[PDB]
Design a protein around this nucleic acid. Sequence first.
RNA 1: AAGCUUGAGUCUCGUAGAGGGGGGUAGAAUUCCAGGUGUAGCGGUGAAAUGCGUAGAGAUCUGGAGGAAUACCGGUGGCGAAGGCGGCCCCCUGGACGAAGACUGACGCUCAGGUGCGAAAGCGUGGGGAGCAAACAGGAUUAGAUACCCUGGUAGUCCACGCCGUAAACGAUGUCGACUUGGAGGUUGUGCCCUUGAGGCGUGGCUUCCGGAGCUAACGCGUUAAGUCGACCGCCUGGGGAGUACGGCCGCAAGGUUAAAACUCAAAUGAAUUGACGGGGGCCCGCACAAGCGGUGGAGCAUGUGGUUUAAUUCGAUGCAAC
Lengths: 129, 56, 65
Amino acid sequence: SMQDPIADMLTRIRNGQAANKAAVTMPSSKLKVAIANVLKEEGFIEDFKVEGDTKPELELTLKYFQGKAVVESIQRVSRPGLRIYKRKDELPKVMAGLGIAVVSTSKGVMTDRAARQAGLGGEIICYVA
Amino acid sequence: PVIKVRENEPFDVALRRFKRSCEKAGVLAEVRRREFYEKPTTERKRAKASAVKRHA
Amino acid sequence: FCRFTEEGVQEIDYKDIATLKNYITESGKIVPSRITGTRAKYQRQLARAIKRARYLSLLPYTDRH
RNA sequence: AAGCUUGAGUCUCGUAGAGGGGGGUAGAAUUCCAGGUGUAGCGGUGAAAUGCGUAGAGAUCUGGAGGAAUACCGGUGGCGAAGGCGGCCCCCUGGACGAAGACUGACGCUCAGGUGCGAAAGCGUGGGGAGCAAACAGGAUUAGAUACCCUGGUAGUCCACGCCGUAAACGAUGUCGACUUGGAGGUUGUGCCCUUGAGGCGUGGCUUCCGGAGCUAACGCGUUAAGUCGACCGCCUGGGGAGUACGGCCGCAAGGUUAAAACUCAAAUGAAUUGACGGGGGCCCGCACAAGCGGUGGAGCAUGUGGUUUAAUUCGAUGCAAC
Ligand SMILES: [Mg+2]
Ligand SMILES: [Mg+2]
Ligand SMILES: [Mg+2]
Ligand SMILES: [Mg+2]
Ligand SMILES: [Mg+2]
Ligand SMILES: [Mg+2]
Ligand SMILES: [Mg+2]
Ligand SMILES: [Mg+2]
Ligand SMILES: [Mg+2]
Ligand SMILES: [Mg+2]
Ligand SMILES: [Mg+2]
């Protein structure tokens, strides 16, 4: 079954990074779009664009700065098998700050750092470096 | 391989023709195969080996 | 080289003796697709036709009987 | 609460297929029965013997009777969830796959227990019994030969409805779903473009090999992953003891299944590497064999050893490479 879309997206991204793909196309969602936007803001990717009315397709443009992939490690901590929820002060700092965590924050999906700044916890989706 | 002798044709030539026919048939080989019973598994293995050999 | 493909036929019939005899040897033994250069389904069809002929005693099982 | 199509389905045309189950039937060949011709052996092996044959076998021609399996096609061919399934033809029927399209709208995935299928052998009644063939017998072989080899030969192998429920049931890779540079192909379709010709454009499903990234302990696997993720299960936690005991559950029985403990050992393995070895393969070579010439070994004599003996038989040398 098509159980986790976000995880699938992440996997696709990883594959792209590995195989040096310029653009990665994948089925789209609102939460997915938000995640992509967050990633863009963080500076990992060039540009994202969603196209499709009945079948929405998210296209993601990847960066390869100085002959090497920017998104080095990208892995879910929260999972469909096991969901991880974290408190405000319990929020992780991925690779001593030099690297980030995608958190499902109740005041909009964002970075762990951003959540900390806000004063709000939630579900820690993915670990991005 | 039923073989008949033509007029204006030597015996040796006829023999040779017969031999060729036999070769074409593969009767001797068949007999060899059937001389002793082969387990299906063994036959399959042999076939696989032959296939492998074919690849060069 | 497959003749059947060149022809463009739906079914190989046991009626045509002249085509079927070209694809078996004198003793009464079927010639492979690897030698003739035939498509596999077509080969199968041909074999079936040959079998039918044998059943009807149109082309022999063995040339000595 | 309300909706969507891409997931998952069903409908239109097809596609091939050892997909099953049931019913018919074809050929060859073996065996046997009967007869005809025929005569000295046949059969077997490394060589033989047991066997068969002066009653006429084998050989061989004709007539049959049967039982089983389907040569050739046949191919890392195909189909199936697997186990498996190959003569042909019909009936019943499952599924797969595809092409254009139409519609349902998450109906999805896995699965504890549970249920069904499940090679072989075996077991059960009833059949059937040609070959083959456990067991069994004889012959050999052999130091012995309960074997390998030969001649024979019962159960079984074959069907009928049941039981069994194990296989190295093995892709030794759970099942499903997603993604990631490739090639050579093969297989199975299909749709366009003037098919201007077998063909061309590409472009979807299915299987095989090599191999990039990657991965791993390497070997290797490698868009059918053992790669990058997700789900879900199942199972492992040193070897042995032991997948055994005991108990349960199942079994007509054989046993199967679940599944220990004590004690015991410091290993148990896995891959690969250098070796050595092989009654493995390839290469070459030596008086190694062959072909030859003479010996020794038999005799006496010389000598040296050992063994026994002697008061002492100095001591060392011990396959070649001590005598
Ligand atoms: Mg609707
Ligand atoms: Mg059985
Ligand atoms: Mg029985
Ligand atoms: Mg025997
Ligand atoms: Mg004996
Ligand atoms: Mg088992
Ligand atoms: Mg098997
Ligand atoms: Mg296993
Ligand atoms: Mg490979
Ligand atoms: Mg047991
Ligand atoms: Mg002497």
